[PDB]
Design a protein around this ligand. Structure first.
Ligand SMILES: [Zn+2]
Ligand SMILES: [Zn+2]
Length: 582
């Protein structure tokens, strides 16, 4: 409590002395409330005109058009302390898991240099605008780094002054760039050095890419076992316990010298104790605190979500296999059995999972896993959209399993080679590509974002008739040499000015470990589509009059956009498809 957060609270109090008031009508039960001060301010979703003009049939599809229009009673909830048996299972599993992850990796500090390069090609390192305009400016100014130095020496002293969250099933906690640097300095190694790669962690998929995830799920399928289970947690971040935060902090046991102390301070001062400012319209700024739940940078959140999810799913697998009888209390011989299970089969059991933060797929030894719920419920990882004690419904077809918002199709090329391709409802793909975020987009920047979506579709979603055609239309409508952009940057091989067929060959043939025959593909016509009925099942408009007219008259739509952008160098990509190839 207040001895760790008081300095932070006291500093905010004194910057708003003409405002500070201990409000009585405060809406907090589960958060500690400390006081309020005077403020007033608010970013909606804007439409990408280049993508919309080239996807006219979708202008009358509500699932697309509604995406561009327009719980915080989940953040104000409180998870119960797990039983002693649950706490023991988690501590033994976490200790074993950090050792496995660290066998072939060395924890290390991330550098001002690495941080500087990051800001200077835009990663979403959720910072705030204000003493400098942007992050790009602060990073060049030596005053900033003296502010970083002050706080850093405070963290070595076991104290914190400026590491405060700003709050804005979602909730995003920005800190100032200084706080984010110190987080990145101490814990950036987890992402930067790929601790959650599939090579290193066996369950993880960090850095694997949407063209690899389907092949990974198919490899899990080839294990002897029962169904595939893919249970979502209801509000994962809100269900992270103080016990979870303490098992995560054990990564510091693998560290040394200064790094060890810097990492311990991030865990102690910013994760296990938190200070947050929230805008209330009644407009006052509330300064509130709590010990539990997830509130880190999005990239550290991803790695620690993956770790604690891997831990929770190994414990659920232990319960299914009868390694322990009750969560109330582990006997001495049950502890030795849990330890022995981990040593003996732990790595095999990790290989049976695919885990991406809070998202998992598990192929357990058998279907006893379906009803093994006491540990999972007692850890607070309560399943979404199913009654607390109802057995999980598993999948018997790896092509049906949901993972990272996708399902995966097995697609045989005319030459017999096998592509395992990512897919989702096509209304979701078109509806997302029609949205831009933020203000001051030039026509050129809007066109270059359209091109980024077009290139992503050609690489990942080439098997969807509507998207291959729309991609070629967008690429034909945007100047050939203009560089694709995004504003929040899986591996993004579509972000390039290289010929996308050369990129398709590198990703799907040359660099694909599941493809033994490395014969290059010479044209887009060698590259197959889903069955027409499967394409309709996954949202295609093939067969509709609106879609037929759009396809037939596509050069008229391309010419409309070219006329808006003006007299530039364009390429006609439409003859890469049979029907336009004369
Ligand atoms: Zn601090
Ligand atoms: Zn599909």
């Amino acid at each position: 409590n207040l001895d760790i957060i008081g300095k932070r609270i006291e500093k905010i109090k004194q910057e708003h002395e003409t405002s500070w008031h201990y409000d009585q009508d405060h809406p907090y039960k589960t958060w500690a409330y400390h006081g309020s001060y005077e403020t007033k301010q608010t970013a909606s979703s804007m439409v990408n005109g280049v993508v919309r003009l080239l996807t006219k049939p979708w202008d009358i599809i509500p699932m697309v058009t509604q995406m561009a229009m327009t719980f915080k009673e989940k953040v104000d909830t409180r998870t119960q302390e797990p039983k002693e048996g649950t706490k023991k299972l988690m501590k033994i599993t976490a200790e074993w898991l950090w050792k496995e992850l660290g066998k072939k990796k060395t924890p290390r500090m991330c550098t001002r240099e690495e941080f500087t390069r990051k800001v200077r090609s835009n990663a979403a390192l959720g910072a705030i605008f204000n003493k400098w305009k942007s992050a790009r400016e602060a990073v060049e100014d030596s005053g900033f780094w003296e502010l970083v130095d002050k706080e850093r020496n405070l963290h070595l002293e076991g104290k914190c002054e400026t590491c405060v969250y700003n709050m804005m099933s979602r909730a995003i906690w920005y800190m100032w760039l200084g706080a984010r640097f110190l987080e990145f300095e101490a814990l950036g190694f987890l992402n930067e050095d790929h601790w959650f790669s599939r090579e290193n962690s066996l369950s993880g998929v960090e850095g694997e890419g949407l063209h690899k995830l389907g092949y990974i799920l198919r490899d899990v399928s080839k294990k002897e076992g029962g169904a595939m289970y893919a249970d979502d947690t209801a509000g994962w971040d809100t269900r992270i316990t103080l016990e979870d935060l303490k098992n995560e902090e054990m990564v510091t046991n693998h560290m040394e010298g200064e790094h060890k102390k810097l990492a311990e301070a991030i865990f102690k001062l910013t994760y296990q104790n938190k200070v947050v400012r929230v805008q209330r319209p009644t407009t006052v700024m509330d300064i509130i605190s709590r010990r539990d739940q997830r509130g880190s940078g999005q990239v550290v959140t991803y790695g620690l979500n993956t770790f604690t999810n891997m831990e929770a799913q190994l414990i659920r697998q232990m319960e299914g296999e009868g390694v322990f009888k009750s969560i109330q209390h582990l006997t001495v011989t049950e502890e030795i059995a849990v330890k022995n299970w981990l040593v003996r089969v732990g790595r095999e059991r990790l290989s049976r999972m695919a885990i991406s933060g809070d998202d998992c797929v598990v192929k357990p030894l058998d279907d006893r896993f379906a009803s093994a719920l006491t540990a999972l419920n007692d850890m607070g990882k309560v399943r979404k959209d199913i009654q607390q004690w109802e057995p999980s419904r598993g999948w018997n077809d790896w092509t049906q399993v949901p993972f990272c918002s996708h399902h995966f199709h097995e697609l045989i090329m005319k030459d017999g080679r096998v592509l395992v391709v990512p897919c989702r409802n096509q209304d979701e793909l078109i509806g997302r590509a029609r949205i831009s975020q933020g203000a001051g987009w030039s026509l050129r920047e809007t066109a270059c974002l359209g091109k980024s979506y077009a290139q992503m579709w050609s690489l990942m979603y080439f098997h969807r008739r509507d998207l291959r055609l729309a991609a070629n239309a967008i690429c034909s409508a945007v100047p050939s040499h203009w560089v694709p952009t995004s504003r929040t940057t899986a591996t993004h091989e579509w972000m390039t000015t290289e010929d996308m067929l050369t990129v398709w060959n590198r990703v799907w043939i040359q660099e694909n470990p599941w493809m033994e025959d490395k014969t290059p593909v010479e044209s887009w016509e060698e590259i197959p589509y889903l069955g027409k009925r499967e394409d309709q099942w996954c949202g295609s408009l093939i067969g509709l009059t609106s879609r037929a007219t759009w396809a037939k008259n596509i050069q008229t739509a391309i010419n409309q956009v070219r006329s808006l952008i003006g007299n530039e160098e364009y390429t006609d990509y439409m003859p890469s498809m049979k029907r336009f190839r004369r």
